[PDB]
């Protein structure tokens, strides 16, 4: 272990027990002015801390183990990429809606799958798109899971 790692897992543990609905979100690839915007807009509605995923999964694991329920131990299944713990009391559907609302248009990346559809966007197509000032991909905080009274809510379910 490292110093900060024991300290910082206790910070995350403390968070998870801090509130009812416990969500993993993803802030990977998201530009830093755009995170400050969102972070400002959700200030009194959720708490959001980013931290290493290996450590996020630790926290979750010990939080559940120490709350004596499995159904938090299962958020670690869905931890990938830029994974930040986000906790709050607003129910998972309102949190899907909030976070979506605070998505902001951005230029698609080279090699990326075009989410609107399926096709890989070459480096030069995107370099051109980016040149024009075109911003077609909807970007912001991205839910991986939410926990709420004995079950997991996977965006699979949350959109429609």
């Amino acid at each position: 272990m490292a110093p900060w790692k024991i300290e910082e897992v206790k910070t995350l543990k403390g968070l998870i027990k801090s509130k009812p609905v416990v969500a993993i979100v993803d802030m990977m690839d998201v530009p830093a002015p755009q995170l400050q915007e969102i972070r400002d807009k959700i200030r009194d509605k959720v708490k959001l801390r980013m931290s290493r995923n290996t450590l996020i999964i630790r926290a979750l694991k010990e939080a559940a183990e120490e709350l004596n329920n499995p159904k938090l131990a299962e958020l670690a299944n869905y931890v990938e990429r830029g994974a930040a713990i986000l906790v709050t009391d607003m129910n998972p559907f309102k949190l899907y809606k909030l976070l979506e609302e605070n998505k902001s248009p951005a230029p698609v990346r080279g090699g990326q799958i075009a989410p609107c559809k399926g096709e890989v966007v070459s480096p030069k197509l995107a370099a051109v798109l980016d040149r024009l000032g075109i911003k077609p991909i909807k970007v912001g905080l991205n839910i991986l899971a939410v926990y709420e009274d004995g079950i997991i809510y996977t965006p699979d379910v949350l959109k429609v």
Binding site: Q36, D40, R43, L132, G133
Partner: protein, 158 residues
């Protein structure tokens, strides 16, 4: 396409060349309507450096002018009534402003700032104030950043 063009003008006295011209004349919109609309919304700030954002639609030649607030450096200088700040910051004093005025500059600029409370936006300003050898209240502005932290000043705030 759409082109955003961000430039620093002199408030009120914007011209059709250069800063505006080499940027906006390309896009094929009347450079004079823009120089007009800039000089309208920056009547107050006469003779100071001001940010100006031009959002143009190239196809439809249509535009909008979103004017900002001066650099906080410029603001500090203006409450002081001063030409030029310290030549060698922290090794001289250009002038001293009160806390209250700092609060005015702070309150004036909170939206451009990423600190959400007028305390810490004053702290930001202070940080500028210290960059040019201005003193906030006899003190190094640094000194009072921590005094704000200790709550020494929780009378002005809220």
């Amino acid at each position: 396409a759409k082109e955003v063009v961000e430039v620093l003008v002199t408030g009120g006295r914007a011209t059709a060349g250069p800063p505006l011209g080499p940027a906006i004349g390309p896009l094929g919109v009347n450079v004079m309507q823009v120089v007009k609309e800039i000089n309208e919304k920056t009547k107050d700030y006469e003779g100071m450096q001001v940010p100006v954002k031009v959002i143009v639609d190239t196809e439809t030649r249509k535009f909008e002018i979103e004017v900002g607030i001066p650099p906080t450096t410029a603001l500090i200088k203006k409450e002081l009534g001063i030409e030029t700040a310290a030549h060698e910051p922290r090794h001289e004093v250009v002038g001293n402003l009160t806390l209250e005025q700092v609060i005015k500059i702070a309150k004036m600029k909170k939206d451009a700032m990423l600190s959400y409370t007028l305390k810490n936006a004053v702290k930001e300003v202070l940080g500028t104030c210290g960059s040019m050898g201005v003193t906030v209240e006899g003190k190094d502005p640094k000194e009072v950043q921590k005094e704000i932290d200790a709550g020494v000043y929780d009378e002005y705030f809220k």
